[PDB]
Design a protein around this ligand. Sequence first.
Ligand SMILES: [Zn+2]
Ligand SMILES: [Zn+2]
Length: 264
Amino acid sequence: DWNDPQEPFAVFGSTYYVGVRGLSAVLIASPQGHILIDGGSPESAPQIAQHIRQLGFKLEDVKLILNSHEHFDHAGGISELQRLSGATVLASVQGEKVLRSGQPSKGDPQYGELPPMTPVANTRAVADGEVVKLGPLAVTARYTPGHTQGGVSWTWRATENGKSAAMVYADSLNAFAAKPFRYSGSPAYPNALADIKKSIATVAALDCDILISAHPDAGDLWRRQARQAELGSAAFIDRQACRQYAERAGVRLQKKLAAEAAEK
Ligand SMILES: [Zn+2]
Ligand SMILES: [Zn+2]
């Protein structure tokens, strides 16, 4: 279902959606080369490539591929997209380790139920708050771990027709765990609860004109895009979108902690 067809579209300025129906990917284009956020799953990668080409861009102009988090459904397509492009792949320090090996971390909240990925070469770790620069593009890494040990949300500004928008590619904030992992306390990933609560607050506080979340439905992307026909790019603007997304994650976390008590 996630990999179902989805036509690509301009979001704001040189920023495009190029993902699939249930898994985001975002192209940030420029005459000096492009930045691609995420690769979906292995099945998504050829669709993302076709979406990039369909819009009139070339894969070999993609210089950098950024990862939200190091799971099969968002990083699994990265190896193939890197093969098509020659791009360097960027991630947090923790995320980079999984991307390079393809092997789920033993501290992953979902460790045990995660498939391996094809190892990714030409990676580079980014620090929290590090700005990724490419010509007129400047994309900031905001560490938002908790869903994974290495999750990263990405922020940048896009411009068109004299207007500008604070763009937010939000990582998943969902407290989801494979047995026997517990957010209430697990020595494999001892800071998981503190991390996810801090990441929820981080995303809630972001300068957030246009939100695109790793699962697009979870940040209401299709509800907003459904108004593009009437409103143009303003359909995507909603300065409460990141706070609403973070509040929903906070509710899911409380439900997860309650479910964990019933297993204690
Ligand atoms: Zn995940
Ligand atoms: Zn996921």
